[PDB]
Amino acid sequence: NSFVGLRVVAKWSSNGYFYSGKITRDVGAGKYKLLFDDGYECDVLGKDILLCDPIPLDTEVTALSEDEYFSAGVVKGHRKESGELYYSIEKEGQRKWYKRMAVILSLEQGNRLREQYGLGPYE
């Protein structure tokens, strides 16, 4: 048994930022059989939709504000319940508990991690 019910990030093309996903089963070497945190399922190769925390417990990440123009706040405490999801983003001096889609992350906040926790098992 392992991470076949894992916590994931969602990038289709590398365009500099990722959305959120959750896994259902593991598909081969490099792949994940996944559904988005909001209900969109597929099987894909992982360097797109992969095994995350999502991101490090010290992370000034981006919070859902505009498309190229979004603003940062910090991941500190997070959990996932059997049909409820909450990520505590420390923002504006207070904690915003959002299901993972109200946070985003960019590639280099992903790439720092990519080798150690998730953001690429395959090349």
Curated annotation (Swiss-Prot):
Subunit structure: Homoligomer. Interacts with p53/TP53 (via the central domain). Interacts with DCLRE1C. Interacts with histone H2AX and this requires phosphorylation of H2AX on 'Ser-139'. Interacts with histone H4 that has been dimethylated at 'Lys-20' (H4K20me2). Has low affinity for histone H4 containing monomethylated 'Lys-20' (H4K20me1). Does not bind histone H4 containing unmethylated or trimethylated 'Lys-20' (H4K20me3). Has low affinity for histone H3 that has been dimethylated on 'Lys-79'. Has very low affinity for histone H3 that has been monomethylated on 'Lys-79' (in vitro).
UniProt domain comment: The Tudor-like region mediates binding to histone H4 dimethylated at 'Lys-20' (H4K20me2). Interaction with NUDT16L1/TIRR masks the Tudor-like domain and prevents recruitment to chromatin. The UDR (ubiquitin-dependent recruitment) motif specifically recognizes and binds histone H2A monoubiquitinated at 'Lys-15' (H2AK15ub). Phosphorylation of the UDR blocks interaction with H2AK15ub.
Cross-link annotation Glycyl lysine isopeptide (Lys-Gly) (interchain with G-Cter in SUMO2), location: 80
Glycyl lysine isopeptide (Lys-Gly) (interchain with G-Cter in SUMO1) cross-link, chain position(s): 80
Disruption outcome: Mice display growth retardation and are immune deficient, radiation-sensitive and cancer-prone. Cells show a slight S-phase checkpoint defect and prolonged G2/M arrest after treatment with ionizing radiation. Cells show defects in the DNA damage response. Mice display defects in immunoglobulin class-switch recombination (CSR) during antibody genesis. In contrast, no defects are observed in classic NHEJ and V(D)J recombination.
Region (Tudor-like): 1-120
Protein name in the entry: TP53-binding protein 1
Range within the parent protein: 1481 to 1603 of 1969
Superkingdom, taxonomy of origin: Eukaryota
Compartment(s) where it occurs, according to its Swiss-Prot or TrEMBL record: Nucleus; Chromosome; Chromosome, Centromere, Kinetochore
Lineage, uppermost ranks: Eukaryota, Metazoa, Chordata, Craniata, Vertebrata
Renumbered residue ranges of the record's region Interaction with dimethylated histone H4: 12-40
Post-translational modification summary for this protein: Phosphorylated at basal level in the absence of DNA damage. Phosphorylated by ATM in response to DNA damage: phosphorylation at different sites promotes interaction with different set of proteins: phosphorylation at the N-terminus by ATM (residues from 11-181) promotes interaction with PAXIP1 and non-homologous end joining (NHEJ) of dysfunctional telomeres. Phosphorylation by ATM at residues that are located more C-terminus (residues 300-650) leads to promote interaction with RIF1. Interaction with RIF1 leads to disrupt interaction with NUDT16L1/TIRR.
Function according to Swiss-Prot or TrEMBL: Double-strand break (DSB) repair protein involved in response to DNA damage, telomere dynamics and class-switch recombination (CSR) during antibody genesis. Plays a key role in the repair of double-strand DNA breaks (DSBs) in response to DNA damage by promoting non-homologous end joining (NHEJ)-mediated repair of DSBs and specifically counteracting the function of the homologous recombination (HR) repair protein BRCA1. In response to DSBs, phosphorylation by ATM promotes interaction with RIF1 and dissociation from NUDT16L1/TIRR, leading to recruitment to DSBs sites.
Signal sequence coordinates: none
